From a paper:
In this pathway, which is conserved and essential in mycobacteria, trehalose is synthesized in a two-step process involving OtsA and OtsB2 enzymes.
Structures with donor substrates were determined by soaking the apo form crystals with ADP-glucose and GDP-glucose. The donor substrates interact primarily with the C-terminal domain through the side chains of the highly conserved Arg286, Lys291, Asp385, and Glu393 and with the side chain of Arg365, which is conserved in all mycobacteria and closely related species but less conserved outside this group. N-terminal domain interactions with the donor substrate are observed only for His168 when the active site is in an open conformation. Preference for ADP-glucose as the donor substrate in MtrOtsA is conferred by interactions with the deeply buried adenine moiety. A highly coordinated water interacts with the primary amine of the adenine moiety and the carbonyl groups of Leu359 and Arg361. The presence of the leucine in M. thermoresistibile allows the primary amine of the adenine moiety to occupy a buried position, interacting with the carbonyl group of Leu319 which no other nucleotide activated donor can occupy. The binding affinity of substrate donors could be determined only for ADP-glucose under the tested conditions with an observable Kd (dissociation constant) of 27.17 ± 2.66 μM.
Author numbering:
A (entry chain A), B (entry chain A), C (entry chain A), D (entry chain A): 7 to 23, 32 to 477
């Protein structure tokens, strides 16, 4: 019946493609828990039409979920990325409502639930991850009412006015309510969920504000209670802090500045390419600052590192076209031959190279239109043990709830985005250090370990 | 100092362009109150660069507000229609954030406040109308703290996640909080407003659900309390009921059906042209039903009457192009020469002609994506004293909160929109009558008089 | 070796899909020649992956060419319709240059040549039809130097400045030069071909103007001479004339006018849907005339009958969208419920119904941007034995070279298109008759029989 | 009556904006003729609403033509740049036919003719320049039949099938026929003009091919004959040759290569931004070569220098957007931070800097879709006295008729454009020198002086 007493369910297995374990991430965050539990991980291995035979990793048992390329297209590229993703992110792009996508999403979700049941021992603890798998908790509780089930959403949970658009709004809500604990990064998501529970499902809920890792909400579902909480994700702050101190990284950061023609100021953007990330906004702000002579085109350069994402989704292709136009435009207007003012890469950057960029950057531009947390904001902070740099951060990130000492911006307020970029570029050394010290105190004290433990303690208490 | 003890403030004066009073509307709803008060109306006369000399109407004193064509472009076509309107309607279209529009909106709002102060006697009651004038209550209270000020929003008040986009979010919120009473059509708007008050402004508010014309919310603003309520607007039900019974109207309805080639079923759409109104959705549903042979192209016709709106706003021009494409397409595919399946007019229809269409229509299609109330739903119901017809109504209207006996649809769920249109077309006489009787009981009992009195009683109680 | 002494090669067999002979067309025009020759027809049967076994029709032997759906996509929808077609029609739409399309076009052309060789007896006469098969004459002469080969292009032959764009310009030119006779509708095409022969291929040609069915051009290709001529295609004028006189047709024409609400004037457009046909132009002209009050929206109606074409080619889908927008727009602006000013059908009209429309129409609108001949202009004329009606005809048709008594227009000169439509609508009975009599004298004397005989006499003389 | 016996008429005066004479160009080419004649120049000074008082330059008398910003918009940006320009260049972009533009073009042309008459002495020689002023010769001959009038078109003269689109085709043709000599860069243009003369105007013309600076064509216009010829424009080859040899230029070329990260190969594009210039084609070719690994992204760089043009014309803005997208795209895909594979400037480059780029570039990419001559091809050749470099040149330039030793390409044949770019990048030193020597022999022997003298000798012989 499966001999795992702790099970993680996520769209992907924690491996890279023969194959090896992916570095960092949740799987590393859960390392010391797997040392005391019989742990399993359920997910798609990332290859189409694979076996579903369990793979032993010593520390982990991997249960591959079989998906065809067609399953992936309709469940993932379709329903997950082109229905749920834009809807949950404040419909920045118009969601597509497609019944064939929904039906595949249901099937695939069931397949994940079945795989989980195979792995899970009696009374096992299950942690379901993220928006692609919102039906699993209910499906799992129906197959296996003995299980303790947690669910955490890594993206925002939208306001009810928007969520209601979903023709399958009730099925998704019922899906989440199959969990013992439903967690979000922010109290706002939790409160939206409680309100949805009363409005759409008619369940009795708690009415108080939801705290951070405390003051939990409750939804009554017949005989049982669903716990609702906010657990803001973070990074392995100490590890990144240590990694950024390496001599090789610091020398690379110096070499990067030399390769850029030794600018006095470097702005940096690091993003998975997504319309949620507000890359177009920072480029527009930068172009207008150059037009206004408020940024010196001779000693200031912007580096944007976009890692490719969701190429088969038309909205992402269109966003890529817009950004790339902006890059060519800005350089043609304000650059010189042999000296761009914008450097842009559309590719995955090796982790040590990326860290060197964090170390090199005088201003980190993290300006999403809407983002669940955004780890890049926290990664930059963790890397600046030298206390240099400046973080310009959108209010519409979960990170802005913790990183209040950054230069916060409303990305829709372009005038203030521009004022703020100038302010960050021209800050005094002391003021820069004051902010970075405060940000680091936060990020170092609130790491992924605290997050993981807080969620699992909450989940454990529902027993 | 002005000798009016009751003052209405709205973007437009209640006149038609020399000039005469506009029929119906709020000005008719307030007729018996003006018989017992010295009443004034403040608004733009609809002509550019006019005098601001008061005009006596016997029952009313009209205070024209001077606006230039440029004022109208930036305050109205700009900020009101291309910033606030799309934002408040769940960003169906992308709002434009423009500082020049904001500054004009502020100036014009101040000009309205000044005009109000001129007209208003000491201790006068003021009722400010709608989204173009959200700054007036605060501006007015600053000029004239002796006044009792009510404000009613005729469009939805969006969720906080969306409202927060507005770079001038705080100024707008402070603006509304200048009122003694802030009213919305729905509890949902009221509750969004209270939540915004706590989150953005930090004011202490009530935490309970907001009732309908009862169980009011409260926002504490220093020394004074702001009342927050839901007052769902309606029509002069009895008057429209009476008007629809005229012999001439009923004969016209018969003649309309003959001019349409005597179809067995007529579907009707009546809308101010707006992307909020979901005209594209009903056309898509109709086209697919015809493709699927689920509607008989030989005996069923759809009439769409769009009255022109906001021609200088690009989004409205684009929507008009899309709808008109759909019309040509559907007729080219399923019509015959001499017999369209879709009749479409882009023009204002005389009121008696419009009522004849309500009487003629077997199915009323009211399918907005998002609408504050939508009066057309209620007008149709009021017209069907014969108890014929069927109302297909979007859940995303304020009207759907009262007209639950209609055929309710999620307009994003196209499959169900299509199922519902077939069901309404093919309903039994008895089932049709059962629904229409129940709808009429509601609409006849809850008219614009009840709405107006409920709001003003609430406003009066803040003294 | 095949026992046919006269062979027609065309993209399609002359059949309809079991199957029966297509009415009218070239196959009917060649009926009395097949009575004195052993005739064969080579072409695709219109079904994918068919046999290539000959089919005896008594009067004809049909040699089916096997094509896969992929062959059709790349050779026909691709190279023929999306490379050659827009290029030859003055690049109204941007040609797509695709090497995979070219290679398939070559393969398919070879397959046609092989099929021809199978059917053709020693010394047989072969008539290759149109732009999809321009490589066949050279390929055929290489396989079978005993054959007499004619080729006729049914579309315009573009000026050299445009033809030169084609990366495979030389291969196409060499292809055509494989024929003993290369014929075009117009001297202009013939002269373009001669000039191309000198410029691109370097062959010695004649330098005189090319006559109509006379004064032929010559291209010297080593040992042999290629004849170049103009043979303007026509219709079976006498048959259509006779058909239009039927009592049933005339009664249908009257019934059509009654079904249109008995307009005083009917304008008609009849076209295979194509961006070459200038349907968008006549709609624009009509809309502006209505806007200007120069056409009476109360007693004048426009009927447009578009038969579907090339749905898998994006440019045709886009044109359909534009036209259909125009239709919806014009009706929404100038129509009434129950009375459109534009009736539009996107569907094949039965031949007797179409003829009834020709008979009913007061003004025939034939306004292509560029058209090889356009048979509709001549069909209308043939149908008006009552001498009623008016033909408005684009100068950029081959038909305008013969139908000079029509109301000729430059479709790019919209002001004059509009003036001309008013003039045609309001012509005196006598002036209308004078033009229609002259047009009919032309069309009745120059029919498809004269065309076919003239081409084949020219082809025969090369022996 | 004006005391100038030689008069140049062009859209612009030969000055830069107080003001000074523009370097190089036609005005320098005509320097030794002005030393023996009383010369005048008629044109717009480039400022709106100026005086028309003559300005003495000692060597020249400048007659400013008064134009308002509105005149410029409708005559120049409108008719010239958005009607004639796309039409004459094979409708790469769709011409706009606008009667208001035409009427302004007529008025402005008349104003130029009047200014000319003011300056011109009895029996004076007049040289009218280019496509904005095609009506002047007829207008001038009507005012002043004593004048000898030449006209030269600097852009291609399109084939008749395209020219015929122009609603004002006859007025333009009559306009040109007002000249004693009409000259084009190429025999092809001359021959198109003769054919147009016979077809549209019905004039008797010569029928032979038109030679280069010889074997002239003739159009008979009543009593007088119009000479038609081909005079391919060139540059001051010797001066540019000398200029490129300067030590400072050669050092700058070396410094440019160092600033580019010392690539082994530099490709260069230099163009006035125009959709005729095929900048999008070379970028596409370069991107695909990089994708295919046929160009080394580590040691090969492309520099594109676009100088801004016609910003108020939407087609030019759209082309700029497309190019700039391509630049950003290619760099994001194949560049490195600190090392773009494409450098792009949208700005006027100082002449000495531009020459340094010619000297630095290993491959010159001159790939227009259609261009009258293209001087950049010849400028590059003149600069390479070191015999290094390679010229990749579109067949669809007038320059390709003289520069046959370059690497000629059909820009529509992208496969061959790509093959050719690889071939040019990888040519042997010797083969490179062989081509460059031959090209230089041509360009050095056929300079702007030969062109100017040949045209004026032809013009003089019509006396
Ligand atoms: N060019 C590049 N090269 C190499 N690495 C790059 C890169 N660009 C970004 N990365 C890395 O990818 C990760 C992106 O982190 P995000 O917070 O943006 O996660 P994401 O949006 O994908 O997932 C969701 O989950 C996370 C965690 O819950 C939330 O922060 C987020 O809001 C939510 O959308 C970072 O670790 C970052 O360093
Ligand atoms: N073709 C036509 N010819 C003639 N008359 C036509 C017409 N089409 C529509 N009308 C009339 O115009 C009015 C439209 O009523 P709506 O409820 O849609 O108001 P509207 O959206 O403009 O204003 C806002 O205020 C009202 C009242 O608060 C809210 O119902 C609404 O949600 C909100 O957007 C109806 O009275 C209707 O009969
Ligand atoms: N809605 C409808 N319903 C039923 N029938 C319809 C119809 N619309 C058009 N037709 C019929 O289809 C034919 C179209 O004739 P065209 O001259 O336009 O041919 P087409 O352009 O396809 O072919 C090419 O070959 C012919 C003949 O050489 C050239 O005239 C032409 O220029 C060239 O492009 C007519 O017989 C017409 O009556
Ligand atoms: N980025 C940059 N910075 C500085 N200078 C730059 C530049 N880009 C281009 N130039 C210069 O501008 C000129 C462009 O020459 P073209 O031949 O392309 O002329 P153009 O097309 O404008 O005019 C028309 O006239 C000429 C002459 O008859 C014809 O060659 C042409 O076909 C026709 O369209 C060159 O002298 C070139 O060196």
């Amino acid at each position: 019946s499966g001999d795992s007493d702790f099970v993680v369910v996520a769209n992907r297995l924690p491996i890279d493609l023969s194959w090896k374990r992916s570095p960092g991430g949740l799987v590393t965050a859960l390392e010391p828990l797997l040392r005391r539990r019989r742990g399993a991980w359920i997910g798609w291995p990332g290859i189409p039409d694979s076996d579903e035979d369990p793979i032993v990793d010593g520390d982990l048992v991997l249960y591959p979920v079989r998906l065809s390329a067609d399953d992936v297209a309709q469940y993932y590229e379709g329903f997950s990325n082109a229905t749920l993703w834009p809807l949950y992110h404040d419909v920045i792009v118009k969601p597509i409502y497609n019944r064939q996508w929904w039906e595949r999403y249901v099937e695939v979700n069931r397949r994940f639930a079945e795989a989980t049941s195979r792995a899970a021992a009696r009374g096992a603890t299950v942690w379901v991850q993220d928006y692609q798998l919102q039906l699993v908790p209910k499906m799992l509780r129906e197959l296996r009412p003995d299980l303790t089930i947690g669910f955490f959403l890594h993206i925002p949970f939208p306001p009810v006015e928007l969520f209601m658009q979903l023709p399958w709004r009730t099925e998704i809500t019922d899906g989440l309510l199959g969990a013992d604990l439903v967690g979000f990064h922010l109290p706002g998501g939790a409160q939206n969920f409680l309100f949805l529970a009363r409005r759409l499902v008619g369940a009795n809920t708690s009415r108080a504000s939801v705290g951070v890792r405390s003051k939990f909400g409750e939804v009554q579902i017949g005989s049982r209670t669903v716990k609702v909480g906010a657990f803001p994700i973070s990074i392995d702050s100490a590890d990144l802090d240590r990694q950024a101190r390496q001599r090789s990284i610091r020398q690379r950061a110096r070499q990067i500045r030399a390769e850029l023609g030794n600018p006095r100021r470097i702005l940096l953007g690091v993003d998975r390419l997504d319309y949620t990330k507000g890359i177009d906004v920072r480029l527009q702000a930068f172009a207008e600052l150059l037009a206004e002579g408020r940024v010196n085109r001779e000693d200031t350069v912007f580096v944007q590192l976009a890692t490719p994402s969701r190429e088969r989704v038309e909205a992402y292709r269109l966003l890529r076209d817009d950004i790339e136009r902006q890059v060519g435009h800005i350089n043609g207007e304000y650059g010189e031959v042999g000296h761009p003012v914008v450097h842009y890469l559309h590719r995955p950057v090796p982790r040590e190279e990326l860290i060197a960029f964090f170390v090199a950057a005088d201003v980190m531009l993290v300006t999403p239109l809407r983002d669940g947390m955004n780890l890049v904001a926290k990664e930059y902070v963790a890397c600046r043990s030298d206390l240099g740099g400046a973080l310009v951060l959108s209010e519409f990130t979960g990170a802005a709830a913790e990183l209040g000492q950054a230069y916060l911006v409303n990305p829709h307020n372009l005038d203030h985005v521009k004022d703020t970029m100038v302010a960050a570029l021209n800050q005094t050394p002391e003021e820069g250090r004051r902010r970075m010290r405060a940000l680091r105190r936060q990020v170092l004290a609130h790491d992924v370990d605290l997050w993981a433990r807080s969620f699992l303690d909450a989940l454990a208490s529902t027993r």
